[PDB]
Design a protein around this ligand. Structure first.
Ligand SMILES: *[C@@H]1O[C@H](CO)[C@@H](O[C@@H]2O[C@H](CO)[C@@H](O[C@@H]3O[C@H](CO[C@H]4O[C@H](CO)[C@@H](O)[C@H](O[C@H]5O[C@H](CO)[C@@H](O)[C@H](O)[C@@H]5O[C@H]5O[C@H](CO)[C@@H](O)[C@H](O)[C@@H]5O)[C@@H]4O)[C@@H](O)[C@H](O[C@H]4O[C@H](CO)[C@@H](O)[C@H](O)[C@@H]4O[C@H]4O[C@H](CO)[C@@H](O)[C@H](O)[C@@H]4O)[C@@H]3O)[C@H](O)[C@H]2NC(C)=O)[C@H](O)[C@H]1NC(C)=O
Ligand SMILES: O=C(OCc1ccc(OC(F)(F)F)cc1)N1C[C@@H]2CN(C(=O)[C@@H]3CCc4[nH]nnc4C3)C[C@H]2C1
Ligand SMILES: [Ca+2]
Ligand SMILES: [Cl-]
Ligand code: NA
Ligand code: NA
Ligand SMILES: [Zn+2]
Length: 806
């Protein structure tokens, strides 16, 4: 109960919340039905509207008015935003030339430039260009400030997961808001867009910007705004707050608009009805900037204009129904729409089996517009598994489509023409970023980046130490005039061994065989040099990766490749090699088909053996450096060493062989040479982090050879492709992947066809950031370049999406 007998007089939009004194006056009391009786009268005044008029100029103060045009309004800080324009002959901010803001120009007593985050729901990246004619204030922020062509949201591309990612720098799986609708089995509680439960503190993990600020002595305005408070009032409140005394004034503020998302849902992303919402948003930005200009704060405040996600065309007729696939449809619960999450309707149902469900949903229709996954098999780049609120069974839905449980759910819930929530690499889901102010750069375009990076930057903008998060701090230094964060490269934890020839052939009883025993001082001194590392400068272009955890490993040198070989995991952690544009593909000779050779630098006890592979009817083996790309017939023997071998399912060998035999050479030709680092990944607990030895759930039968969950490759070349990969003077170009190591190709519906028809599509889906691979391997790449460390960090966060231009 709320005894709302108290008063909001002098308390409107109070920053500090109240419990004991019964009545509340903050922009959140509406959501609790706990506002003072006089809240509306005192705090939501509307009289005379939102703009000054010529006749209102100089008027006597009338406290009933929504905003003021009297002479005293400026010092009081409550003028209508157009006051100086209408009454004092000033120009609107949008009509002023832009001028570089080299330094904050703030009133006396401002300790730091304030930050205002202007966030817009459903603001698709392409609106910046397509709506540019009707959005002059936003176009000025964009062209005069720092802007990306687009910003990548997190999956799912829903409002709460994204806004809370912006606030925390965390993947949804870590912050816990993994959808707009959620069931937590530990609390036995449901989170819904509508209602009370979403306000419970237990849903919201990590440390959002406002708590980071408060704990470090920096005051914050409220982030959440009640839906019925009009945008003009939201603006005027922020402007009022900015006029508070030094000791009370917040340094960080948030505005939120329900538009253009609200209209996009009803009309689609480019419905003709979409022009007006874009116009209204721009008008709100104008009121803010005019308002700042009035307060002499328009060259003081840093302003971020940011979206949560974009918007796609989706209509009722484009719905797949699980009732068309399952006979058991009433035994499951589905979280429906632009993603699917399935669990058992009842945890008492012993007959429920996720395996039969997955099978019944796999490639059953010609043009199936969703694909089923166990969550740990979803593309690693989505970081969407490590939370008990994410159901084991997930459906990735094609863009433009919906999944539902049965037709009644869709016609007894066509209204909507737009939706969002799809895979975060989908172009229509891309959103916006503009930064404008003394701390951002002037007239600067930056490459697209992910929204997980912004928390760190907002901390930099406010002088805060960020809480631990999923951004890569420093990777956005190129957005900033000053306040850059300059990290040091992490220290290597394990130094490598450099073994020479220590074992005789006969010491190895591995059950391996090779027709290699066919016999010169010219080329024998030459091969010893290669084994000492004489070609290493060619195949290790960016220095060796640092191992950031305690382990035992060897560096192994060869003519065509170098590797860091793990004595603990009995395989390389990484294998590095350069393939030039002129390089040639050769076949595996007949006498070498099933050849595996003991490596005389590495003990039998730290080697794989062929007998385990023979015994394991499910498991076969592949090579990290591809024999097909050896530089000569003599060098090819190196690719058959037991230390270059890794466990592979025959189904995965089809993918891997096509990558190695076909695609590497294709990249080398397209990119003017490529450097490749490949290796295994072990993530059995699907937390996105390197497993320790005691977390491994599968070994090659009868052995201690651990089975990877994934294979990565990092493919680097010169950004200026007129320069060969191995002779590059400037910035680099990278694409990488994390392929799931699976015993079937059920993921690829076209897989009974030639690899040329399905493998590259699989790899595109499993595209990855170098940073994703770092977390997963405990390695740190690009240690020795001539490039700035921040530039390298940006490169490590790059994701090659394979979407056409936005
Ligand atoms: C993205 O960035 C984030 C942030 O950096 C990374 O997440 C971190 O990963 C760390 C490494 O795994 C993890 O560290 C653990 O912390 C445990 C204590 O955690 C609590 O306290 C912190 C600090 O305030 C808080 O942040 C946590 O909040 C989590 O949990 C609450 C629920 O209570 C959620 O509301 C919240 O959203 C968040 O959940 C997320 O993380 C947890 C895991 O912590 C997941 O379960 C959730 O699904 C969700 O993803 C907590 O309130 C601490 O107990 C751990 O220590 C164990 O393991 C170490 C290994 O070194 C071992 O030495 C210890 O002995 C201990 O083991 C003991 O417990 C085991 C399990 O109970 C048991 O099996 C053993 O036998 C032992 O008895 C560990 O140090 C850190 O918590 C999170 N932080 C966050 C915010 O998520 C993330 O890795 C990044 N992602 C990528 C891909 O890079
Ligand atoms: O005012 C706000 O957000 C400020 C902010 C800015 C930047 C942020 O990020 C950063 F901190 F980084 F700046 C975070 C928050 N919000 C965001 C909420 C999303 N929302 C909803 O989704 C409704 C839920 C109740 C409901 N019932 N039926 N339909 C709904 C939909 C209500 C909005 C009010
Ligand atoms: Ca792991
Ligand atoms: Cl959801
Ligand atoms: Na086998
Ligand atoms: Na298939
Ligand atoms: Zn929406």
């Amino acid at each position: 109960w709320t005894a709302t007998s108290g008063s909001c007089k002098g308390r409107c939009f109070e920053l500090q919340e109240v419990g004991p004194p019964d009545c509340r006056c903050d922009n959140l009391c509406k959501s609790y039905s706990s506002c003072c009786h006089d809240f509306d009268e005192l705090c939501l005044k509307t009289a005379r509207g939102w703009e000054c008029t010529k006749d209102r100029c100089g008027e006597v103060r009338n406290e009933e008015n929504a905003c003021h045009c009297s002479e005293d309004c400026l010092s009081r800080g409550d003028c209508c935003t157009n006051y100086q324009v209408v009454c004092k002959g000033e120009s609107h901010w949008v009509d002023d030339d832009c001028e570089e803001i080299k330094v904050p120009e703030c009133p006396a007593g401002f300790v730091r430039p304030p930050l205002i985050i202007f966030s817009v729901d459903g603001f698709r990246a392409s609106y910046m260009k397509k709506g540019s004619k009707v959005m002059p204030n936003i176009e000025k922020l964009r062209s005069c400030g720092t802007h990306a062509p687009y910003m990548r949201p997190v999956y799912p591309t829903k409002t709460f997961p994204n806004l809370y990612t912006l606030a925390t720098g965390l993947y949804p799986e870590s912050h816990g808001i993994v959808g707009n609708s959620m069931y937590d089995p530990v609390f036995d509680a449901s989170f819904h867009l509508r209602g009370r439960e979403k306000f419970n503190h237990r849903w919201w993990g990590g440390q959002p910007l406002w708590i980071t600020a408060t704990k470090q002595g920096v005051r914050a305005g409220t982030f959440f705004w009640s839906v019925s408070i009009p945008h003009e009032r939201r603006i005027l409140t922020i402007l009022q707050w900015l006029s508070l005394p030094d000791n009370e004034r917040p340094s960080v503020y948030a505005f939120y608009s329900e538009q253009p998302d609200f209209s996009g849902h009803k009309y689609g992303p480019f419905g003709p009805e979409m022009t007006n919402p874009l116009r209204e948003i721009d008008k709100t930005v104008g009121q803010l900037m005019d308002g700042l200009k009035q307060l002499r704060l328009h060259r003081c405040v840093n302003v971020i204009f940011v979206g949560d996600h974009g918007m796609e065309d989706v209509t009722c007729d484009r719905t797949e129904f699980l009732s068309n696939y399952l006979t058991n449809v009433d035994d499951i619960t589905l979280v429906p729409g632009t993603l699917g999450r399935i669990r058992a309707k009842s945890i008492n149902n012993s007959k429920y089996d996720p395996k039969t469900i997955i099978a019944a949903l796999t490639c059953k229709k010609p043009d199936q517009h969703f694909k089923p996954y166990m969550k740990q098999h979803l593309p690693k780049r989505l970081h969407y598994a490590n939370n008990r609120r994410i159901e084991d069974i997930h459906l990735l839905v094609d863009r433009r489509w919906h999944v539902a449980r049965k037709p009644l759910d869709v016609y007894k819930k066509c209204f909507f023409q737009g939706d969002h929530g799809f895979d975060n690499k989908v172009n229509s889901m891309q959103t916006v970023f503009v930064g404008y102010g003394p701390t951002f750069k002037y007239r600067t375009k930056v490459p697209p980046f992910e929204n997980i990076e912004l928390y760190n930057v907002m901390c930099d903008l406010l002088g805060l130490k960020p809480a631990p998060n999923n951004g890569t701090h420093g990777s956005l230094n190129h957005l900033l005039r000053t306040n850059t964060f300059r990290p040091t490269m992490p220290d290597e934890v394990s130094r490598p061994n450099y073994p020479g020839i220590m074992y005789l052939q006969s010491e190895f009883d591995l059950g391996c065989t090779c027709d290699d025993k066919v016999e010169n001082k010219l080329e024998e001194l030459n091969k010893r040099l290669h084994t000492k590392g004489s070609t290493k400068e060619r195949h290790l272009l960016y220095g060796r990766p640092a191992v950031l955890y305690r382990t035992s490993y060897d560096i192994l040198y060869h003519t065509d490749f170098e590797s860091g070989y793990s004595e603990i995991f009995l395989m390389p952690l990484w294998t590095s090699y350069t393939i030039s544009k002129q390089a040639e593909v050769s076949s595996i000779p007949e006498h070498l088909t099933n050849c595996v050779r003991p490596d005389v630098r590495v003990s039998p006890g730290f080697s794989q053996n062929c007998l385990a592979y023979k015994n394991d009817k499910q498991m076969s083996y592949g090579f990290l450096f591809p024999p097909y790309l050896s530089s000569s017939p003599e060098a090819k023997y190196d690719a058959f060493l037991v230390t270059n071998m890794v466990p592979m399912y025959p189904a995965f060998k089809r993918v891997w062989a096509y990558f190695q035999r076909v695609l590497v050479k294709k990249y080398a030709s397209e990119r003017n040479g490529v450097n490749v680092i490949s290796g295994p990944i072990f993530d059995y607990n699907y937390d996105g982090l390197r497993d320790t030895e005691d977390e491994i759930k599968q070994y090659v039968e009868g052995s201690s050879i651990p089975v990877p969950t994934h294979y990565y490759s990092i493919i680097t070349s010169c950004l200026d492709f007129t320069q060969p990969a191995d002779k590059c003077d400037g910035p680099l170009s990278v694409s990488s992947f994390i392929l799931p190591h699976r015993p079937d190709n059920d993921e690829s519906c076209n897989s009974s066809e030639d690899e040329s028809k399905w493998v590259e599509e699989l790899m595109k889906m499993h595209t990855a950031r170098v940073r994703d691979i770092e977390h997963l391997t405990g390695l740190d790449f690009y240690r020795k370049t001539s490039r700035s460390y921040s530039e390298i960090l940006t490169l490590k966060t790059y994701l090659h999406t394979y979407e056409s231009e936005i």
